[PDB]
């Protein structure tokens, strides 16, 4: 067929896949599987596989992938509001699929720039000042680059923050979230797709799951075949950068890949490693001090000089900035940490302090420049 509508559903059935459990086996409670999912949610394969007899359950040998049955244009029902798109996507989706799912069926326009935001997933207040100044910035740069704005996608943390700030053009804004952690998405569920799914936020509801985030224009809901576990989109969401990083849509078939930058806000220790992680793939990385929690913590041992960034200060920053959660840190983890945080620090071409200086006065859009600058040297 020819309707754009019906040329997506056909390739999204055809070539994208979701994950589902092919072996029931409880881990402690009666009635929920170790993938997660309750026995009445399991294919009747799934019971007692004759292949399977006496295995330890294992994500990685048991869970199949079938075409995927959630995909289509998502709609959060506010007044004027533009559908978003989302496909719920195999952890195992290949790199050539999801470029042409991004490409030629979301018809994605290729970006000069991709910008990467990460940090804290729970909700984070942050001072109206350093708002300002993010929403400008990011805003200023994505338009003037035609930039993809990547994030987790769910409706908090630093996710959250960059949906109001592209509130309000054409702003690409792409969720990857955790399929298995979405609250309310039966009713993004159909064989055939939904054009739209009519998405319902009751975050009266949620639990311990997320909400997709309004503000969002696509949307990649990774799928291992597992609920209820957080990390799930993780490797996708790295792998999904190092494409576009790749992408050698640089002017020309020579030498050049289009830049990515990464921004943090407020973090956890999760942060640490998919900062570091980043940097490891010469990914320059902007750190917004006064964000809170690990960007705080970065943005003073970068200001410091080196020899003075040691085990006794970081440990005085974790406490300092993470007034919460220190008290749950193990000693193994706080060594681990601060051993990464060092690590960081040594590569200082690659990580560039944002902080407020009102006789200065700039956005964040100069220091995501500097970045780049001083990452490309
Ligand atoms: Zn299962």
Redesign the pocket.
Request: hydrophobic share 25%; proline share 0%; glycine share 14%.
């Given at each position: 067929k020819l309707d754009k509508r019906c040329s997506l559903a056909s390739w999204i059935k055809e070539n994208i896949k979701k994950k589902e459990?092919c072996?029931?086996?409880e881990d402690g409670r009666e009635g929920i599987?170790?993938?997660?999912?309750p026995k009445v949610q399991?294919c009747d394969e799934?019971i007692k596989p004759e292949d399977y007899m006496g295995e330890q359950?294992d994500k990685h040998r048991?869970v199949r992938e079938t075409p995927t049955d959630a995909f289509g244009d998502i709609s959060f029902g506010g007044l004027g509001q533009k559908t978003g798109k989302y496909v719920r996507v195999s952890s195992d989706t290949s790199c050539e699929n999801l470029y042409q799912l991004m490409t030629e069926q979301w018809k994605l326009r290729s970006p000069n720039l991709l910008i990467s935001v990460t940090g804290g997933a729970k909700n984070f207040y942050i001072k109206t000042h350093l708002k300002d100044k993010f929403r400008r910035g990011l805003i200023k740069v994505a338009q003037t680059t035609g930039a993809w704005i990547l994030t987790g996608g769910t409706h908090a943390g630093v996710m959250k923050h960059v949906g109001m700030a592209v509130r309000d053009g054409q702003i690409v804004v792409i969720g990857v979230a955790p399929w298995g952690v979405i609250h309310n998405r039966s009713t993004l569920i159909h064989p055939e797709g939904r054009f739209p799914a009519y998405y319902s936020l009751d975050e009266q509801g949620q639990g311990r799951l997320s909400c997709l985030d309004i503000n969002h224009t696509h949307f990649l809901l990774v799928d291992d075949?597992?609920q209820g576990h957080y990390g799930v989109e993780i490797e996708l969401r790295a792998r999904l950068e190092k494409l576009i990083s790749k992408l050698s849509l640089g002017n020309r078939e020579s030498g050049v890949t289009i830049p990515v930058v990464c921004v943090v806000l407020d973090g956890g220790p999760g942060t640490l490693n998919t900062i570091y992680n980043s940097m490891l793939n010469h990914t320059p990385c902007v750190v917004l001090e006064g964000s809170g929690r690990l960007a705080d913590v970065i943005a003073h041992v970068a200001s410091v000089p080196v020899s003075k960034v040691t085990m006794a200060l970081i440990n005085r920053l974790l406490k300092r900035f993470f007034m919460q959660e220190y008290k749950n840190f193990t000693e193994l983890q706080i060594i681990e940490w601060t051993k990464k945080i060092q690590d960081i620090l040594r590569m200082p071409h690659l990580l560039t302090v944002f902080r407020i200086d009102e006789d200065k006065n700039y956005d964040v859009d100069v220091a995501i420049l500097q970045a780049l600058l001083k990452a490309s040297r």
């Open positions: 459990c072996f029931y086996v599987c170790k993938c997660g999912y399991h799934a359950w048991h075949g597992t």
